[PDB]
Design an enzyme around this catalytic site. Structure first.
Site, short mmCIF file in Angstrom:
data_model
loop_
_atom_site.label_atom_id
_atom_site.label_comp_id
_atom_site.label_asym_id
_atom_site.label_seq_id
_atom_site.Cartn_x
_atom_site.Cartn_y
_atom_site.Cartn_z
N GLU A 49 20.93 -37.50 9.28
CA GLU A 49 20.67 -38.58 9.86
C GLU A 49 22.06 -39.44 9.30
OE1 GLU A 49 16.72 -40.27 9.61
OE2 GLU A 49 16.32 -38.67 8.38
N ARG A 54 6.86 -34.16 10.27
CA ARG A 54 5.41 -34.27 10.20
C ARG A 54 4.51 -33.18 9.24
NH1 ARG A 54 4.07 -34.57 16.27
NH2 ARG A 54 6.22 -33.91 16.58
N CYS A 66 9.39 -37.18 15.33
CA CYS A 66 9.48 -37.05 14.01
C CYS A 66 9.35 -35.40 13.47
CB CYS A 66 8.48 -37.67 13.10
SG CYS A 66 8.48 -37.56 11.38
N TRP A 79 11.66 -39.42 3.12
CA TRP A 79 12.95 -39.34 2.56
C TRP A 79 13.94 -38.66 3.84
CZ3 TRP A 79 8.42 -36.62 0.74
CH2 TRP A 79 8.27 -35.59 1.24
C1 HEM Z 1 8.78 -37.39 4.48
C2 HEM Z 1 9.94 -37.21 5.07
C3 HEM Z 1 10.30 -37.43 6.51
C4 HEM Z 1 11.22 -36.97 7.28
C5 HEM Z 1 12.41 -35.79 6.61
C6 HEM Z 1 11.23 -37.52 8.63
C7 HEM Z 1 12.10 -37.24 9.57
C8 HEM Z 1 12.45 -38.00 10.86
C9 HEM Z 1 13.75 -38.13 11.59
C10 HEM Z 1 15.11 -37.05 11.09
C11 HEM Z 1 13.58 -38.61 12.51
C12 HEM Z 1 14.52 -39.21 13.57
C13 HEM Z 1 14.96 -40.50 13.33
C14 HEM Z 1 16.32 -40.86 14.01
O1 HEM Z 1 16.99 -39.90 14.66
O2 HEM Z 1 16.48 -42.15 14.36
C15 HEM Z 1 12.17 -39.23 12.33
C16 HEM Z 1 11.69 -39.91 13.21
C17 HEM Z 1 10.41 -40.77 13.05
N1 HEM Z 1 9.66 -40.82 12.06
FE1 HEM Z 1 9.81 -39.35 10.62
N2 HEM Z 1 10.42 -38.22 8.75
C18 HEM Z 1 9.56 -38.59 7.49
C19 HEM Z 1 8.67 -39.42 7.22
C20 HEM Z 1 8.08 -40.26 8.25
C21 HEM Z 1 6.73 -41.15 7.87
C22 HEM Z 1 6.41 -41.23 6.39
C23 HEM Z 1 6.54 -41.75 9.01
C24 HEM Z 1 5.46 -42.82 9.17
C25 HEM Z 1 4.51 -42.97 8.18
C26 HEM Z 1 7.36 -41.23 9.82
C27 HEM Z 1 7.29 -41.69 11.35
C28 HEM Z 1 8.32 -41.35 12.41
C29 HEM Z 1 8.64 -42.15 13.46
C30 HEM Z 1 7.59 -43.13 14.16
C31 HEM Z 1 9.73 -41.57 14.01
C32 HEM Z 1 10.48 -42.11 15.48
C33 HEM Z 1 11.12 -43.34 14.93
C34 HEM Z 1 12.16 -43.85 16.30
O3 HEM Z 1 11.76 -43.77 17.35
O4 HEM Z 1 13.16 -44.52 16.14
N3 HEM Z 1 8.20 -40.28 9.65
N4 HEM Z 1 11.54 -38.74 11.37
C1 AXW Z 2 10.36 -42.86 7.76
C2 AXW Z 2 11.63 -42.19 8.28
C3 AXW Z 2 12.33 -41.15 7.49
C4 AXW Z 2 13.55 -40.60 8.01
N1 AXW Z 2 13.95 -39.39 7.32
N2 AXW Z 2 14.16 -41.16 9.04
C5 AXW Z 2 13.68 -42.23 9.57
C6 AXW Z 2 14.56 -42.67 10.55
C7 AXW Z 2 15.57 -43.88 10.04
C8 AXW Z 2 16.42 -43.16 8.90
N3 AXW Z 2 17.65 -42.94 9.99
C9 AXW Z 2 17.52 -43.47 11.38
C10 AXW Z 2 16.36 -44.44 11.28
O1 AXW Z 2 15.79 -44.52 12.40
C11 AXW Z 2 15.39 -45.82 13.06
C12 AXW Z 2 16.16 -45.79 14.30
N4 AXW Z 2 15.40 -44.98 15.34
C13 AXW Z 2 16.41 -44.52 16.15
C14 AXW Z 2 16.49 -45.58 17.42
C15 AXW Z 2 15.40 -46.03 17.89
C16 AXW Z 2 15.66 -46.93 18.97
C17 AXW Z 2 16.77 -47.63 19.06
C18 AXW Z 2 17.92 -47.26 18.37
C19 AXW Z 2 17.84 -46.19 17.59
F1 AXW Z 2 18.75 -46.06 16.68
C20 AXW Z 2 12.60 -42.73 9.20
#
Ligand code: HEM
Ligand code: AXW
Ligand code: HEM
Ligand code: AXW
Ligand code: H4B
Ligand code: H4B
Ligand code: ZN
Lengths: 409, 411
Positions: A285, A111, A108, A280
């Site tokens: 994305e 963070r 993420c 947000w």
């Molecule tokens: C507040 C603004 C936030 C931004 C700008 C942001 C940004 C991102 C981005 C760009 C990704 C990659 C998603 C992807 O490519 O599929 C991501 C992944 C992730 N974020 Fe954030 N995030 C935010 C908030 C949060 C919050 C509030 C949480 C949990 C409370 C969180 C937990 C995670 C987790 C666990 C992943 C990995 C998800 C996965 O493996 O599919 N994020 N974040």
């Molecule tokens: C909380 C949050 C904030 C933020 N800015 N973006 C995210 C991730 C969301 C919004 N865009 C992609 C989505 O992520 C969920 C899927 N994560 C990627 C993924 C993981 C496993 C398998 C397939 C796959 F696409 C989550």
């Protein structure tokens, strides 16, 4: 044992010690790196170490480590596990745990925000209608009329594993996908299977390109049920371009609230299988991944055509040109409609600052470079040049099997 | 055992068995992944197994494993090691070895080409002047008036580590960098320290923004000597843009021949500390990295200024816009001058075809995702969506310390 990370742009070297507190395994060995792989109940005996580890870090964090209140809580939890085979977290522990699962999420980039998370305790929930209520309240709170606020809603923890709470949706808000006689795909191709599950469970699909999916909610291990989120709660953005007047005619829109709902929150050995969380968007994305992945809305070709670019040869960089424009439009639209969004330059600059804070304040920051570097313009963002160490700390967010594969009807 | 990789765009799943032949360590453990870390005297005892492993690989490749010739060659190398402490590769083995080090280079996107490599055997070389001559010939052969041909020149192997051959240049052709008293840099800031060494050694610096550096060559552990590559041998491309006519007035050019000269080639336990090799460019290496890294030519601002993009907010994506235009310019310019170059779409698509082929015929293809994915437009290339396994096979190219850090100055 002590590890160095270098930034190759700035020469700044940081020393990581936090990795020695690493619990789970990475997938890598000394012989093979699995860095680019997407995806690489607890008996009484396993649960107490996990609880102790967590409470120790919690009491340390409030500067009360080894205090009577620390030792008292450890005994209370020990007694509860010995007697009930599980235990319940204090509100303070649950909040600390959720904030830390985000702090620990190596994939993420956002963070820097980790300590500002609104935690909604839904452990008293018992039915899918209750889950729907909690989720609308989360959706409305987080959306805040475009001024988005990070939130998580935590449903009851796993017990014997036959009474699981699950949100079947992968995100709270997504668009339907339908295969047509034509052979093509209408709407979002990622959601075809889920859309069909919705249909097979009763949903009246409007069969359009941007149909907000219904929530499909599973309470207490029961069969999941359908609910339409009130449209006035789903903030959506029409996509236009600040220079190209034809852009709006593609008829593109996206939703304002990114809300992941298929992950499992692990705190002190307890497993929260339904824990939707939201923040947000970072612009890429939507503009790079959602719109331009070949297997997603895949719009590069249509856009390039409207720009009158030379699509004869890859070396004209027509894809790259269209890509930038699509991403300018995403950001402009969200900004014009006052819906919180961050661009990849700003978000990666903030993440570097967050890494430095974490190294200075905590002795490290687990980060997965493969995920952290934006899917466009990689090397012009500071994260590209930043060495990152990836390791797994708890509390954590973990992937879990899609419920339709597990659930017995 | 079997390991699977998935392409998330196509759902194609491949199975790796080749990782079972990996010997060297990655840097990673079960508890830490060092996948984004840039950088994560042999006795007889350690040498014969390494020789045997290599010769077994060679003899298998020619379909002669366990032949009399295979057995006689093992015996002969064995005897050579025991008596002389090292051994010499046959020409055929050297060629096979160098091609395989390229095939095994997990950070290289261009490996579809691995079997077309001109190997120049420079093991009879003894002096820096000899090295200069060999390198001029490599440059002229590789350049081929713009129709680039991949090549490698291999100088004598390490003996006691006190007699090493080294090319001190990091690449055969690079531009000088000069730090000014006001803290600004003229030319390439990557090459400031090396430029200073050249100057101190007696190089007369023209002090412009694109001064081709002299070769600094060390033979047989001796102090290195300076040589100027004949300018007629250094093919350069002035950079212009197909639509933007002010682009030329930025005064940019680049050289045609990318030629890495600071790596160590290991074949069968032998270490070739001077083994310059060259191919042709992928456009992003120049347009993204050389021109637009903040610590390199850093031209984004000046380009975007001239394009009149909105620069007051990063969210206008001005940097991304200017970045695409620069990269169009680089590919246009090379193509217009008939100098071989490949765009990042072509190169990654070819890499994925190479990788699938390797999985079928070889049982795998070690690949470092962090390096293979291009530094712009990552996810619109097919490699972004491809899972890759990274492990170390020999023969191989390895990093080695910069020679100014270790050299014993003779005076
Ligand atoms: C507040 C603004 C936030 C931004 C700008 C942001 C940004 C991102 C981005 C760009 C990704 C990659 C998603 C992807 O490519 O599929 C991501 C992944 C992730 N974020 Fe954030 N995030 C935010 C908030 C949060 C919050 C509030 C949480 C949990 C409370 C969180 C937990 C995670 C987790 C666990 C992943 C990995 C998800 C996965 O493996 O599919 N994020 N974040
Ligand atoms: C909380 C949050 C904030 C933020 N800015 N973006 C995210 C991730 C969301 C919004 N865009 C992609 C989505 O992520 C969920 C899927 N994560 C990627 C993924 C993981 C496993 C398998 C397939 C796959 F696409 C989550
Ligand atoms: C023929 C066309 C070739 C192309 C298009 C190509 C492309 C590239 C690129 C883009 C990189 C990454 C460079 C960087 O970001 O610094 C690279 C790395 C590398 N390539 Fe190639 N390559 C080619 C030929 C060769 C040849 C002939 C060899 C040796 C015989 C070679 C061996 C390597 C090695 C060892 C690396 C890693 C370099 C390092 O770690 O610094 N490649 N290749
Ligand atoms: C043979 C070859 C062909 C090709 N197309 N590109 C290359 C790589 C050359 C040309 N562009 C960059 C240069 O790479 C050399 C070093 N690689 C980066 C590097 C490695 C270790 C440490 C620091 C560092 F910047 C080599
Ligand atoms: C195979 C590879 O790991 C996969 O395509 C990854 C690469 N990096 C990513 N990075 C982010 N932020 N999100 C993703 O979905 C992916 N996909
Ligand atoms: C820290 C990080 O590993 C480093 O910046 C890497 C990232 N990926 C790269 N990829 C290529 N091809 N070349 C590079 O120099 C780098 N640098
Ligand atoms: Zn690893």
């Amino acid at each position: 044992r002590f590890l160095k990370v270098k930034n190759w742009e700035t020469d700044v070297v940081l020393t990581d010690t936090l990795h020695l507190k690493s619990t789970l395994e990475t997938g890598c060995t000394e012989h093979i790196c699995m860095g680019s792989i997407m995806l690489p109940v607890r008996t009484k005996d396993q649960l107490f170490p996990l609880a102790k580890e967590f409470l120790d870090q919690y009491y340390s964090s409030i500067k009360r480590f080894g205090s009577k209140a620390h030792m008292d809580r450890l005994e209370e939890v020990n007694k509860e596990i010995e007697s009930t085979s599980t235990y319940q977290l204090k509100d303070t522990e649950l909040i600390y745990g959720a904030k830390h699962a985000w702090r620990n999420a190596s994939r993420c980039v956002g963070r820097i925000q980790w300590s500002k998370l609104q935690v909604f305790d839904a452990r008293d929930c018992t039915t899918a209608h209750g889950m729907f209520n909690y989720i609308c309240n989360h959706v409305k709170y987080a959306t805040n009329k475009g001024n988005l606020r990070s939130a998580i809603t935590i449903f009851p923890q796993r017990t014997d594993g036959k009474h699981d709470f699950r949100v079947w949706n992968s995100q709270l808000i997504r668009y339907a996908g339908y295969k047509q006689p034509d052979g093509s795909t209408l709407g979002d191709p990622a959601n075809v299977q889920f859309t069909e599950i919705c249909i097979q469970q009763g949903w009246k699909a409007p069969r359009g390109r941007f149909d907000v999916l219904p929530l499909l909610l599973q309470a207490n291990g029961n069969d999941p049920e359908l609910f339409q989120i009130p449209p006035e709660l789903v903030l959506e953005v029409p996509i236009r371009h600040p220079k190209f007047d034809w852009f709006k005619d593609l008829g593109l829109k996206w939703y304002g609230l990114p809300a992941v709902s298929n992950m499992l929150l692990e705190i002190g050995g307890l497993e929260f299988s339904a824990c939707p969380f939201s923040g947000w968007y970072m612009g890429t994305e939507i503009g790079v991944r959602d719109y331009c992945d070949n297997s997603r809305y895949n719009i590069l070709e249509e856009v390039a055509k409207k720009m009158d670019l030379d699509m004869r040869k890859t070396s004209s960089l027509w894809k790259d040109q269209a890509l930038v424009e699509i991403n300018i439009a995403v950001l402009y639209s969200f900004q014009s409609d006052k819906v919180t969004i961050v661009d990849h330059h700003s978000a990666t600059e903030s993440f570097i600052k967050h890494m430095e804070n974490e190294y200075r304040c905590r002795g490290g920051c687990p980060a997965d470079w493969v995920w952290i570097v934006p899917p466009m313009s990689g090397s012009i963002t500071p994260v590209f040049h930043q060495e990152m160490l990836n390791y797994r700390l708890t509390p954590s967010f973990e992937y879990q099997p899609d419920p339709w594969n597990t659930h017995v009807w």
